[PDB]
Write a protein that binds this ligand. Structure first.
Ligand SMILES: Nc1nc2c(ncn2[C@@H]2O[C@H](COP(=O)(O)OP(=O)(O)NP(=O)(O)O)[C@@H](O)[C@H]2O)c(=O)[nH]1
Ligand SMILES: [Mg+2]
Lengths: 46, 184
């Protein structure tokens, strides 16, 4: 056995269009923080 | 132990979410939303060596020029896909999406993809397909085009059915494998 096809798979961060400020939503913790910081406006209310 | 993150550029089945969806996890999309990034989980064992890959979706122009540093062109090989039957997208994706390959990876290889065996149905397509002298594009035709442009080479079919995705994965993970050298 050499190459094997992936088994696992799960939609971790689903980025979408954000009219709020011509930006995206649900921005990944890294993506968001990279430029912005809040995945969705204010990340999330823990 | 080295990371593998293939970047994608384009729309209408570009290999980003379309591939992993069926070509990998099989399961189809869930929440319909402009895949600006979308994350995924996978582990390809090359020669018996677990790994952590992820299809990094992107564009390279529409609000991505700023969100590019997050994808880092050096991430790995480029994953691109394009319709098969519908030729209106074939030519386009070529001189339309390829140009972007440099926007996100001006010095990084790019892998093209063409699958659409279940989408086929529109008759008008064939009628025109005869005008382009391309004929009913198939899972093989896509490869031919890739040969002309010269790339990492790929081979695969459309969702639902499976002809042999393990192959394209061997070349998709091999090119990025980057045989580590004994450097101290
Ligand atoms: N097995 C396999 N299926 C493929 C391949 N390329 C595309 N497909 C399938 O053909 C379909 C075309 O892509 P599409 O569904 O438009 O994916 P998308 O571009 O992510 N759009 P959306 O964001 O709405 O889900 C996909 O559902 C995908 O499962 C491939 O190389 N292999
Ligand atoms: Mg998608």
């Amino acid at each position: 056995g050499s190459i094997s096809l992936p088994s696992d798979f799960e939609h971790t961060i689903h980025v979408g269009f954000d009219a709020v400020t011509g930006e995206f939503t649900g921005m990944p913790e890294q993506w968001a923080r990279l430029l912005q910081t809040s995945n969705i406006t204010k990340s999330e209310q823990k | 132990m080295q990371t593998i993150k293939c970047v994608v550029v384009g729309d209408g089945a570009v290999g980003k979410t379309c591939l992993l969806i069926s070509y990998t996890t099989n399961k189809f999309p869930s929440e319909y939303v402009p895949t600006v990034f979308d994350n995924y989980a996978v582990t390809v064992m090359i020669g018996g060596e677990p790994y952590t890959l992820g299809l990094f979706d992107t564009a390279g122009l529409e609000d991505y020029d700023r969100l590019r540093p997050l994808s880092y062109p050096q991430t790995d090989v480029f994953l691109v896909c394009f319709s098969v039957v519908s030729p209106s997208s074939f030519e386009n994706v070529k001189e339309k999406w390829v140009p972007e390959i440099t926007h996100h990876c001006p010095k990084t290889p790019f892998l093209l993809v063409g699958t659409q065996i279940d989408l086929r149905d529109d008759p008008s397509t064939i009628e025109k397909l005869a005008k382009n002298k391309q004929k009913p594009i198939t899972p093989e035709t896509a490869e031919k085009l890739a040969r002309d442009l010269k790339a990492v080479k790929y081979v695969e079919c459309s969702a639902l059915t499976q002809k042999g995705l393990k192959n394209v994965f061997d070349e998709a993970i091999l090119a990025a494998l980057e045989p580590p050298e004994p450097k101290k």
